[PDB]
Design an enzyme around this catalytic site. Structure first.
Site, PDB file in Angstrom:
ATOM      1  N   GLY A 154      -1.172  -2.927 -15.913  1.00  0.00           N
ATOM      2  CA  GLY A 154      -1.613  -3.964 -16.831  1.00  0.00           C
ATOM      3  C   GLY A 154      -1.437  -5.350 -16.247  1.00  0.00           C
ATOM      4  N   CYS A 155      -0.313  -5.586 -15.576  1.00  0.00           N
ATOM      5  CA  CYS A 155      -0.087  -6.886 -14.952  1.00  0.00           C
ATOM      6  C   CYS A 155      -1.047  -7.100 -13.785  1.00  0.00           C
ATOM      7  CB  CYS A 155       1.389  -7.040 -14.553  1.00  0.00           C
ATOM      8  SG  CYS A 155       2.588  -6.994 -15.965  1.00  0.00           S
ATOM      9  N   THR A 156      -1.333  -6.045 -13.019  1.00  0.00           N
ATOM     10  CA  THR A 156      -2.339  -6.148 -11.967  1.00  0.00           C
ATOM     11  C   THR A 156      -3.704  -6.519 -12.543  1.00  0.00           C
ATOM     12  OG1 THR A 156      -1.128  -4.577 -10.604  1.00  0.00           O
ATOM     13  CG2 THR A 156      -3.485  -4.865 -10.136  1.00  0.00           C
TER      14      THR A 156
END
EC number: 1.11.1.24
Length: 154
Positions: free
Chosen positions: A44-46
């Site tokens: 998700g952060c990527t």
């Protein structure tokens, strides 16, 4: 909890090269979109950070800059930015001090935990222009920030 219309205090943290960076200097040439993410390199952060990456030209058009921030160590931020070819700073908030200033720090019995995913659009006078909170989609962080900056164009 930091909200639109609040003034952010200046702060300093190291970027992915270990070089101290200061909010007031990052604000030199326009607003900063400061995006707190829980954990570098997770899917998700990527997605969120790669969407910021892919919008480089659009942020430049509104003369604004992107800055990621998490509690991850410099060495992990460095690998995340290298693997994903990020063209912007990732700050390491290794004790959660800046997260606490923004009201997004998390901990459990003294163990520092990942921050709550939150984006602050910060103007050159340190006013908060917009906040995108943790329930929004990953793309919405950059999309809403960009739309806010376009809305205030002259």
């Amino acid at each position: 909890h930091m909200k639109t219309g609040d003034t952010v205090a200046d702060f300093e943290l190291p970027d992915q090269t270990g070089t101290p960076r200061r909010l007031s200097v990052l604000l030199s040439d326009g607003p900063v979109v400061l995006f707190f993410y829980p954990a570098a390199m997770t899917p998700g952060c990527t997605k969120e950070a790669c969407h910021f990456r892919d919008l480089a030209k659009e942020f430049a058009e509104v003369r604004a800059s992107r800055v990621g921030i998490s509690t991850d160590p410099v060495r992990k931020q460095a690998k995340f930015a290298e693997v994903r070819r990020f063209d912007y700073p990732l700050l390491s908030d290794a004790q959660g001090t800046v997260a606490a200033q923004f009201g997004v720090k998390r901990g459990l019995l003294g163990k520092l935990m990942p921050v709550k995913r939150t984006t602050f659009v910060i103007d050159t006078d340190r006013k908060v222009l917009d906040v995108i909170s943790s329930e929004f989609s990953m793309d919405a962080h950059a999309d809403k920030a960009l739309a806010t900056l376009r809305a205030i164009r002259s």
